[PDB]
Design an enzyme around this catalytic site. Structure first.
Site, PDB file in Angstrom:
ATOM      1  N   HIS A 142       0.819  -1.221   0.000  1.00 50.90           N
ATOM      2  CA  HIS A 142       0.000   0.000   0.000  1.00 50.90           C
ATOM      3  C   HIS A 142       0.855   1.276   0.000  1.00 50.90           C
ATOM      4  CE1 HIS A 142      -3.367  -2.752   1.187  1.00 50.90           C
ATOM      5  NE2 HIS A 142      -3.931  -1.983   0.267  1.00 50.90           N
ATOM      6  N   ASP A 186      -8.660  -0.687  -8.261  1.00 51.40           N
ATOM      7  CA  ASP A 186      -7.943  -1.082  -7.047  1.00 51.40           C
ATOM      8  C   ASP A 186      -7.325  -2.464  -7.190  1.00 51.40           C
ATOM      9  OD1 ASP A 186      -6.937  -0.415  -4.539  1.00 51.40           O
ATOM     10  OD2 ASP A 186      -8.862  -0.682  -3.496  1.00 51.40           O
ATOM     11  N   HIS A 202      -6.531   7.237  -2.871  1.00 45.58           N
ATOM     12  CA  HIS A 202      -7.461   6.370  -2.158  1.00 45.58           C
ATOM     13  C   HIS A 202      -6.808   5.559  -1.053  1.00 45.58           C
ATOM     14  CE1 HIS A 202      -5.678   3.242  -4.662  1.00 45.58           C
ATOM     15  NE2 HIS A 202      -6.165   2.387  -3.789  1.00 45.58           N
ATOM     16  N   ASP A 203      -5.471   5.512  -0.976  1.00 38.45           N
ATOM     17  CA  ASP A 203      -4.815   4.795   0.118  1.00 38.45           C
ATOM     18  C   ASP A 203      -3.850   5.708   0.867  1.00 38.45           C
ATOM     19  OD1 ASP A 203      -5.852   2.097   0.367  1.00 38.45           O
ATOM     20  OD2 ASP A 203      -4.825   1.530  -1.455  1.00 38.45           O
ATOM     21  N   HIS A 215       1.414   1.628  -5.680  1.00 47.79           N
ATOM     22  CA  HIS A 215       0.068   1.079  -5.795  1.00 47.79           C
ATOM     23  C   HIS A 215      -0.908   2.151  -6.267  1.00 47.79           C
ATOM     24  CE1 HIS A 215      -3.986   0.036  -3.954  1.00 47.79           C
ATOM     25  NE2 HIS A 215      -3.813  -0.801  -4.956  1.00 47.79           N
TER      26      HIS A 215
HETATM   27  C1  LIG Z   1      -4.517  -6.551  -6.182  1.00 47.55           C
HETATM   28  C2  LIG Z   1      -4.726  -7.424  -4.985  1.00 47.55           C
HETATM   29  C3  LIG Z   1      -5.267  -6.791  -3.776  1.00 47.55           C
HETATM   30  C4  LIG Z   1      -5.454  -7.577  -2.714  1.00 47.55           C
HETATM   31  C5  LIG Z   1      -5.981  -7.126  -1.399  1.00 47.55           C
HETATM   32  C6  LIG Z   1      -7.346  -7.668  -1.028  1.00 47.55           C
HETATM   33  N1  LIG Z   1      -7.793  -7.233   0.274  1.00 47.55           N
HETATM   34  C7  LIG Z   1      -8.571  -7.985   1.109  1.00 47.55           C
HETATM   35  O1  LIG Z   1      -9.271  -7.547   2.009  1.00 47.55           O
HETATM   36  C8  LIG Z   1      -8.520  -9.419   0.875  1.00 47.55           C
HETATM   37  C9  LIG Z   1      -9.693 -10.129   0.928  1.00 47.55           C
HETATM   38  C10 LIG Z   1      -9.642 -11.484   0.711  1.00 47.55           C
HETATM   39  C11 LIG Z   1      -8.431 -12.080   0.454  1.00 47.55           C
HETATM   40  F1  LIG Z   1      -8.380 -13.405   0.242  1.00 47.55           F
HETATM   41  C12 LIG Z   1      -7.264 -11.356   0.406  1.00 47.55           C
HETATM   42  C13 LIG Z   1      -7.304 -10.001   0.621  1.00 47.55           C
HETATM   43  C14 LIG Z   1      -7.592  -5.869   0.651  1.00 47.55           C
HETATM   44  C15 LIG Z   1      -6.189  -5.406   0.372  1.00 47.55           C
HETATM   45  F2  LIG Z   1      -5.339  -6.016   1.238  1.00 47.55           F
HETATM   46  F3  LIG Z   1      -6.149  -4.082   0.656  1.00 47.55           F
HETATM   47  C16 LIG Z   1      -5.726  -5.675  -1.044  1.00 47.55           C
HETATM   48  N2  LIG Z   1      -5.125  -8.899  -2.831  1.00 47.55           N
HETATM   49  N3  LIG Z   1      -5.233  -9.845  -1.886  1.00 47.55           N
HETATM   50  C17 LIG Z   1      -4.779 -10.924  -2.521  1.00 47.55           C
HETATM   51  N4  LIG Z   1      -4.388 -10.710  -3.813  1.00 47.55           N
HETATM   52  C18 LIG Z   1      -4.617  -9.427  -3.981  1.00 47.55           C
HETATM   53  N5  LIG Z   1      -4.414  -8.672  -5.075  1.00 47.55           N
HETATM   54 MG   LIG Z   2      -7.398   0.816   0.382  1.00 50.62          MG
HETATM   55 ZN   LIG Z   3      -5.812   0.473  -2.914  1.00 54.80          ZN
END
Ligand SMILES: Cc1cc([C@@H]2CN(C(=O)c3ccc(F)cc3)CC(F)(F)C2)n2ncnc2n1
Ligand SMILES: [Mg+2]
Ligand SMILES: [Zn+2]
Length: 341
Positions: free
Chosen positions: A81, A233, A121-122, A85
Protein backbone atom coordinates in the site's frame (compact mmCIF):
# COMPACT_ATOMS: atom_id res chain seq x y z
CA UNK A 1 14.12 21.18 -0.36
CA UNK A 2 13.87 18.01 -2.39
CA UNK A 3 10.18 18.46 -3.15
CA UNK A 4 10.94 22.07 -4.07
CA UNK A 5 13.39 21.14 -6.82
CA UNK A 6 11.10 18.34 -7.96
CA UNK A 7 8.24 20.84 -8.01
CA UNK A 8 10.32 23.34 -9.96
CA UNK A 9 11.01 20.89 -12.78
CA UNK A 10 7.51 19.41 -12.82
CA UNK A 11 6.01 22.88 -13.25
CA UNK A 12 8.49 24.65 -15.53
CA UNK A 13 9.81 21.85 -17.79
CA UNK A 14 6.45 21.11 -19.47
CA UNK A 15 4.16 18.07 -19.56
CA UNK A 16 5.59 15.09 -21.43
CA UNK A 17 3.35 13.63 -24.16
CA UNK A 18 1.75 10.47 -22.84
CA UNK A 19 2.96 8.51 -25.90
CA UNK A 20 6.54 9.32 -24.91
CA UNK A 21 6.18 7.40 -21.64
CA UNK A 22 5.88 4.07 -23.47
CA UNK A 23 4.59 2.90 -26.84
CA UNK A 24 2.03 0.68 -25.05
CA UNK A 25 1.17 3.13 -22.26
CA UNK A 26 -2.57 3.17 -23.05
CA UNK A 27 -3.01 -0.60 -23.46
CA UNK A 28 -4.49 -3.06 -20.99
CA UNK A 29 -1.31 -5.07 -21.51
CA UNK A 30 0.94 -2.33 -20.10
CA UNK A 31 2.29 -2.77 -16.56
CA UNK A 32 2.60 0.68 -14.93
CA UNK A 33 4.76 -0.73 -12.15
CA UNK A 34 7.40 -0.89 -14.93
CA UNK A 35 7.68 2.88 -14.78
CA UNK A 36 10.53 4.17 -12.59
CA UNK A 37 9.05 5.79 -9.49
CA UNK A 38 10.91 9.03 -10.25
CA UNK A 39 8.86 9.34 -13.48
CA UNK A 40 5.40 8.77 -12.01
CA UNK A 41 4.44 12.34 -11.03
CA UNK A 42 5.14 13.50 -14.58
CA UNK A 43 3.13 10.53 -15.86
CA UNK A 44 0.21 11.62 -13.66
CA UNK A 45 0.35 15.05 -15.29
CA UNK A 46 0.59 13.48 -18.75
CA UNK A 47 -2.52 11.37 -18.06
CA UNK A 48 -4.45 14.35 -16.67
CA UNK A 49 -3.51 16.35 -19.77
CA UNK A 50 -4.33 13.51 -22.16
CA UNK A 51 -7.80 13.09 -20.64
CA UNK A 52 -8.19 16.89 -21.15
CA UNK A 53 -8.99 17.52 -17.46
CA UNK A 54 -6.37 20.28 -17.11
CA UNK A 55 -7.92 22.29 -19.92
CA UNK A 56 -11.54 21.36 -19.27
CA UNK A 57 -11.38 22.31 -15.58
CA UNK A 58 -8.81 25.10 -16.02
CA UNK A 59 -6.55 23.60 -13.40
CA UNK A 60 -3.74 25.90 -12.28
CA UNK A 61 -0.46 24.26 -13.26
CA UNK A 62 1.49 25.34 -10.12
CA UNK A 63 -1.35 24.12 -7.87
CA UNK A 64 -1.57 20.85 -9.78
CA UNK A 65 2.18 20.26 -9.67
CA UNK A 66 2.17 20.83 -5.92
CA UNK A 67 -0.89 18.66 -5.47
CA UNK A 68 0.59 15.71 -7.36
CA UNK A 69 3.81 15.85 -5.33
CA UNK A 70 1.93 16.26 -2.05
CA UNK A 71 -0.14 13.20 -2.93
CA UNK A 72 2.94 11.11 -3.77
CA UNK A 73 4.56 12.26 -0.51
CA UNK A 74 1.37 11.30 1.39
CA UNK A 75 2.12 7.60 0.95
CA UNK A 76 4.30 5.57 3.25
CA UNK A 77 6.35 2.62 2.08
CA UNK A 78 4.69 -0.64 3.22
CA UNK A 79 5.27 -3.49 0.76
CA UNK A 80 1.96 -3.10 -1.11
CA UNK A 81 0.00 0.00 0.00
CA UNK A 82 2.55 2.54 -1.23
CA UNK A 83 2.62 5.27 -3.87
CA UNK A 84 3.36 2.77 -6.65
CA UNK A 85 0.07 1.08 -5.80
CA UNK A 86 -1.79 4.40 -6.06
CA UNK A 87 0.04 5.20 -9.28
CA UNK A 88 -0.88 1.88 -10.88
CA UNK A 89 -4.50 2.19 -9.74
CA UNK A 90 -4.63 5.70 -11.25
CA UNK A 91 -3.08 4.36 -14.44
CA UNK A 92 -5.78 1.73 -14.71
CA UNK A 93 -8.39 4.47 -14.44
CA UNK A 94 -6.68 6.14 -17.39
CA UNK A 95 -6.88 2.81 -19.27
CA UNK A 96 -10.63 2.57 -18.66
CA UNK A 97 -10.92 6.11 -19.99
CA UNK A 98 -8.84 5.36 -23.10
CA UNK A 99 -10.31 1.90 -23.79
CA UNK A 100 -13.94 1.80 -22.59
CA UNK A 101 -15.55 5.13 -23.65
CA UNK A 102 -16.53 6.25 -20.17
CA UNK A 103 -18.08 9.48 -21.45
CA UNK A 104 -21.06 7.43 -22.67
CA UNK A 105 -21.76 6.39 -19.05
CA UNK A 106 -20.44 9.03 -16.67
CA UNK A 107 -20.44 12.80 -16.30
CA UNK A 108 -17.14 14.53 -16.99
CA UNK A 109 -16.79 15.51 -13.35
CA UNK A 110 -17.42 11.92 -12.22
CA UNK A 111 -14.59 10.63 -14.44
CA UNK A 112 -12.34 13.36 -13.05
CA UNK A 113 -13.29 12.50 -9.47
CA UNK A 114 -12.57 8.82 -10.11
CA UNK A 115 -9.05 9.58 -11.30
CA UNK A 116 -8.26 11.97 -8.45
CA UNK A 117 -9.76 9.46 -6.01
CA UNK A 118 -7.52 6.75 -7.42
CA UNK A 119 -4.46 8.92 -6.73
CA UNK A 120 -5.60 9.50 -3.14
CA UNK A 121 -7.46 6.37 -2.16
CA UNK A 122 -4.82 4.80 0.12
CA UNK A 123 -3.14 7.96 1.45
CA UNK A 124 -1.08 7.42 4.61
CA UNK A 125 -1.74 3.64 4.71
CA UNK A 126 0.27 2.07 7.53
CA UNK A 127 0.19 -1.42 6.07
CA UNK A 128 -2.54 -2.71 8.38
CA UNK A 129 -6.23 -3.34 7.76
CA UNK A 130 -9.40 -1.98 9.36
CA UNK A 131 -9.77 -4.76 11.95
CA UNK A 132 -6.23 -4.03 13.17
CA UNK A 133 -7.02 -0.36 13.82
CA UNK A 134 -9.87 -1.40 16.11
CA UNK A 135 -7.88 -4.22 17.69
CA UNK A 136 -4.84 -2.02 18.35
CA UNK A 137 -7.05 0.90 19.53
CA UNK A 138 -5.31 3.15 17.04
CA UNK A 139 -5.93 6.87 16.72
CA UNK A 140 -7.72 6.18 13.44
CA UNK A 141 -10.16 3.81 15.12
CA UNK A 142 -10.75 6.35 17.89
CA UNK A 143 -11.80 8.79 15.13
CA UNK A 144 -13.79 6.57 12.77
CA UNK A 145 -14.50 3.10 14.19
CA UNK A 146 -18.12 4.06 14.97
CA UNK A 147 -18.67 4.67 11.23
CA UNK A 148 -16.69 1.75 9.80
CA UNK A 149 -14.23 1.79 6.91
CA UNK A 150 -11.65 3.27 9.28
CA UNK A 151 -8.70 3.35 6.89
CA UNK A 152 -10.73 4.61 3.92
CA UNK A 153 -12.20 7.42 5.99
CA UNK A 154 -8.62 8.32 6.90
CA UNK A 155 -7.55 8.22 3.23
CA UNK A 156 -10.37 10.61 2.31
CA UNK A 157 -9.54 12.87 5.28
CA UNK A 158 -5.91 12.88 4.11
CA UNK A 159 -6.93 13.90 0.59
CA UNK A 160 -8.93 16.80 2.02
CA UNK A 161 -6.02 17.86 4.23
CA UNK A 162 -3.90 18.04 1.08
CA UNK A 163 -6.56 20.14 -0.67
CA UNK A 164 -6.74 22.36 2.42
CA UNK A 165 -2.95 22.88 2.31
CA UNK A 166 -2.16 26.32 0.90
CA UNK A 167 -1.28 26.19 -2.78
CA UNK A 168 -2.61 22.65 -3.30
CA UNK A 169 -6.37 23.02 -3.87
CA UNK A 170 -6.71 22.15 -7.54
CA UNK A 171 -10.47 22.72 -7.17
CA UNK A 172 -10.46 26.08 -5.44
CA UNK A 173 -11.79 28.04 -8.44
CA UNK A 174 -14.71 25.62 -8.96
CA UNK A 175 -18.21 26.90 -8.35
CA UNK A 176 -19.51 26.15 -4.86
CA UNK A 177 -21.81 23.46 -6.24
CA UNK A 178 -19.07 21.87 -8.36
CA UNK A 179 -16.68 21.94 -5.41
CA UNK A 180 -19.23 20.25 -3.14
CA UNK A 181 -19.90 17.75 -5.92
CA UNK A 182 -16.22 16.87 -6.36
CA UNK A 183 -15.57 16.31 -2.67
CA UNK A 184 -18.78 14.30 -2.28
CA UNK A 185 -17.71 12.10 -5.19
CA UNK A 186 -14.26 11.66 -3.65
CA UNK A 187 -15.91 10.59 -0.42
CA UNK A 188 -18.09 7.97 -2.10
CA UNK A 189 -15.38 6.67 -4.41
CA UNK A 190 -12.65 6.37 -1.78
CA UNK A 191 -15.13 4.80 0.66
CA UNK A 192 -16.00 2.24 -2.04
CA UNK A 193 -12.42 0.84 -1.82
CA UNK A 194 -13.42 -0.94 1.40
CA UNK A 195 -14.08 -4.41 0.00
CA UNK A 196 -16.74 -4.80 2.72
CA UNK A 197 -18.57 -2.04 0.88
CA UNK A 198 -18.12 -3.79 -2.46
CA UNK A 199 -19.53 -7.01 -0.99
CA UNK A 200 -22.52 -5.08 0.40
CA UNK A 201 -23.42 -3.55 -2.99
CA UNK A 202 -22.47 -6.58 -5.12
CA UNK A 203 -26.06 -7.74 -5.68
CA UNK A 204 -27.03 -4.22 -6.73
CA UNK A 205 -24.10 -4.30 -9.15
CA UNK A 206 -25.38 -7.60 -10.53
CA UNK A 207 -28.88 -6.14 -10.79
CA UNK A 208 -27.56 -3.08 -12.65
CA UNK A 209 -25.72 -5.22 -15.21
CA UNK A 210 -28.79 -7.44 -15.63
CA UNK A 211 -31.34 -4.72 -16.39
CA UNK A 212 -28.71 -2.71 -18.26
CA UNK A 213 -26.99 0.56 -17.45
CA UNK A 214 -29.31 3.60 -17.40
CA UNK A 215 -27.30 6.80 -17.98
CA UNK A 216 -30.26 8.79 -16.61
CA UNK A 217 -30.32 6.78 -13.35
CA UNK A 218 -28.31 8.54 -10.65
CA UNK A 219 -27.99 5.39 -8.58
CA UNK A 220 -26.55 3.56 -11.60
CA UNK A 221 -23.89 6.28 -11.85
CA UNK A 222 -22.91 5.82 -8.21
CA UNK A 223 -22.89 2.03 -8.53
CA UNK A 224 -20.80 2.16 -11.70
CA UNK A 225 -18.29 4.50 -10.03
CA UNK A 226 -17.92 2.01 -7.17
CA UNK A 227 -17.36 -0.90 -9.57
CA UNK A 228 -14.83 1.03 -11.63
CA UNK A 229 -12.89 2.11 -8.53
CA UNK A 230 -12.77 -1.48 -7.30
CA UNK A 231 -11.67 -2.57 -10.77
CA UNK A 232 -8.84 -0.03 -10.61
CA UNK A 233 -7.94 -1.08 -7.05
CA UNK A 234 -7.55 -4.76 -8.01
CA UNK A 235 -6.12 -4.11 -11.48
CA UNK A 236 -2.77 -5.69 -10.59
CA UNK A 237 -4.51 -9.03 -11.14
CA UNK A 238 -5.34 -8.19 -14.80
CA UNK A 239 -1.70 -8.17 -15.96
CA UNK A 240 0.68 -11.04 -16.70
CA UNK A 241 1.59 -13.87 -14.36
CA UNK A 242 4.87 -12.16 -13.40
CA UNK A 243 2.91 -9.20 -12.07
CA UNK A 244 0.43 -11.43 -10.21
CA UNK A 245 3.25 -13.36 -8.55
CA UNK A 246 5.15 -10.22 -7.49
CA UNK A 247 1.97 -8.53 -6.25
CA UNK A 248 1.16 -11.65 -4.24
CA UNK A 249 4.62 -11.42 -2.67
CA UNK A 250 4.03 -7.79 -1.70
CA UNK A 251 0.55 -8.36 -0.27
CA UNK A 252 1.62 -11.28 1.90
CA UNK A 253 4.77 -9.51 3.12
CA UNK A 254 2.49 -6.72 4.29
CA UNK A 255 -0.16 -9.11 5.65
CA UNK A 256 2.28 -11.32 7.51
CA UNK A 257 3.95 -8.29 9.07
CA UNK A 258 0.58 -7.25 10.50
CA UNK A 259 0.01 -10.84 11.62
CA UNK A 260 3.36 -10.79 13.38
CA UNK A 261 2.14 -7.69 15.24
CA UNK A 262 -1.19 -9.29 16.14
CA UNK A 263 0.69 -12.24 17.70
CA UNK A 264 2.89 -9.92 19.75
CA UNK A 265 -0.38 -8.43 21.08
CA UNK A 266 -1.73 -11.83 22.10
CA UNK A 267 -4.26 -11.94 19.27
CA UNK A 268 -4.91 -14.71 16.76
CA UNK A 269 -4.31 -13.37 13.24
CA UNK A 270 -6.53 -14.25 10.35
CA UNK A 271 -4.96 -17.28 8.73
CA UNK A 272 -4.26 -15.25 5.58
CA UNK A 273 -2.09 -12.95 7.73
CA UNK A 274 -0.39 -15.72 9.73
CA UNK A 275 2.89 -16.74 8.06
CA UNK A 276 2.68 -20.07 9.92
CA UNK A 277 -0.76 -20.96 8.50
CA UNK A 278 -1.28 -19.08 5.22
CA UNK A 279 -1.02 -21.31 2.16
CA UNK A 280 -0.58 -18.73 -0.58
CA UNK A 281 -1.72 -20.74 -3.66
CA UNK A 282 -5.04 -21.63 -1.99
CA UNK A 283 -5.56 -18.06 -0.74
CA UNK A 284 -4.82 -16.63 -4.18
CA UNK A 285 -7.18 -19.09 -5.89
CA UNK A 286 -9.87 -18.24 -3.32
CA UNK A 287 -9.32 -14.50 -3.78
CA UNK A 288 -9.50 -14.81 -7.56
CA UNK A 289 -12.55 -17.09 -7.52
CA UNK A 290 -14.66 -15.25 -4.96
CA UNK A 291 -13.55 -11.62 -5.28
CA UNK A 292 -11.41 -10.79 -8.32
CA UNK A 293 -13.09 -12.83 -11.06
CA UNK A 294 -16.68 -11.72 -10.23
CA UNK A 295 -15.64 -8.06 -10.32
CA UNK A 296 -14.13 -8.31 -13.79
CA UNK A 297 -16.97 -10.50 -15.01
CA UNK A 298 -19.28 -7.62 -14.04
CA UNK A 299 -17.00 -5.15 -15.81
CA UNK A 300 -17.16 -7.37 -18.92
CA UNK A 301 -20.95 -7.64 -18.68
CA UNK A 302 -21.21 -3.85 -18.72
CA UNK A 303 -18.29 -3.16 -21.11
CA UNK A 304 -17.72 -5.95 -23.66
CA UNK A 305 -14.32 -4.47 -24.48
CA UNK A 306 -13.25 -5.38 -20.91
CA UNK A 307 -13.44 -9.09 -21.79
CA UNK A 308 -9.66 -9.46 -21.97
CA UNK A 309 -9.38 -8.27 -18.37
CA UNK A 310 -11.69 -11.00 -17.07
CA UNK A 311 -9.86 -13.63 -19.13
CA UNK A 312 -6.53 -12.46 -17.66
CA UNK A 313 -7.78 -12.79 -14.08
CA UNK A 314 -9.16 -16.23 -14.91
CA UNK A 315 -5.80 -17.16 -16.48
CA UNK A 316 -3.81 -15.97 -13.45
CA UNK A 317 -6.20 -18.05 -11.34
CA UNK A 318 -5.35 -21.15 -13.38
CA UNK A 319 -1.63 -20.38 -12.97
CA UNK A 320 -1.88 -20.61 -9.17
CA UNK A 321 -3.35 -24.11 -9.40
CA UNK A 322 -0.59 -25.12 -11.83
CA UNK A 323 2.25 -23.93 -9.57
CA UNK A 324 0.65 -25.03 -6.29
CA UNK A 325 2.53 -28.34 -6.32
CA UNK A 326 5.78 -26.33 -6.01
CA UNK A 327 4.94 -25.25 -2.45
CA UNK A 328 5.41 -28.88 -1.36
CA UNK A 329 9.02 -29.81 -0.58
CA UNK A 330 9.94 -32.89 -2.60
CA UNK A 331 13.31 -34.47 -2.09
CA UNK A 332 15.62 -32.57 0.22
CA UNK A 333 15.86 -28.80 0.58
CA UNK A 334 18.44 -27.24 -1.70
CA UNK A 335 21.02 -27.34 1.12
CA UNK A 336 20.57 -31.15 1.49
CA UNK A 337 19.71 -30.50 5.14
CA UNK A 338 16.70 -31.49 7.23
CA UNK A 339 17.67 -28.97 9.94
CA UNK A 340 14.49 -26.95 9.35
CA UNK A 341 12.56 -29.85 10.92
C1 LIG B 1 -4.52 -6.55 -6.18
C2 LIG B 1 -4.73 -7.42 -4.99
C3 LIG B 1 -5.27 -6.79 -3.78
C4 LIG B 1 -5.45 -7.58 -2.71
C5 LIG B 1 -5.98 -7.13 -1.40
C6 LIG B 1 -7.35 -7.67 -1.03
N1 LIG B 1 -7.79 -7.23 0.27
C7 LIG B 1 -8.57 -7.99 1.11
O1 LIG B 1 -9.27 -7.55 2.01
C8 LIG B 1 -8.52 -9.42 0.87
C9 LIG B 1 -9.69 -10.13 0.93
C10 LIG B 1 -9.64 -11.48 0.71
C11 LIG B 1 -8.43 -12.08 0.45
F1 LIG B 1 -8.38 -13.40 0.24
C12 LIG B 1 -7.26 -11.36 0.41
C13 LIG B 1 -7.30 -10.00 0.62
C14 LIG B 1 -7.59 -5.87 0.65
C15 LIG B 1 -6.19 -5.41 0.37
F2 LIG B 1 -5.34 -6.02 1.24
F3 LIG B 1 -6.15 -4.08 0.66
C16 LIG B 1 -5.73 -5.68 -1.04
N2 LIG B 1 -5.12 -8.90 -2.83
N3 LIG B 1 -5.23 -9.85 -1.89
C17 LIG B 1 -4.78 -10.92 -2.52
N4 LIG B 1 -4.39 -10.71 -3.81
C18 LIG B 1 -4.62 -9.43 -3.98
N5 LIG B 1 -4.41 -8.67 -5.08
MG1 LIG C 1 -7.40 0.82 0.38
ZN1 LIG D 1 -5.81 0.47 -2.91
Amino acid sequence: SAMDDEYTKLLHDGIQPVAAIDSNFASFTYTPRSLPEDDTSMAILSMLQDMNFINNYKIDCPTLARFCLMVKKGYRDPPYHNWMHAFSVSHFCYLLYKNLELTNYLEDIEIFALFISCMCHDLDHRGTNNSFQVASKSVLAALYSSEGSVMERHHFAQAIAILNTHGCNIFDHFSRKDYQRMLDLMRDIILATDLAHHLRIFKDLQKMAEVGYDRNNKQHHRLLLCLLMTSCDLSDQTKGWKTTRKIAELIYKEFFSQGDLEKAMGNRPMEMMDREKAYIPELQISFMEHIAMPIYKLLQDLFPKAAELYERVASNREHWTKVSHKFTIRGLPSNNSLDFL
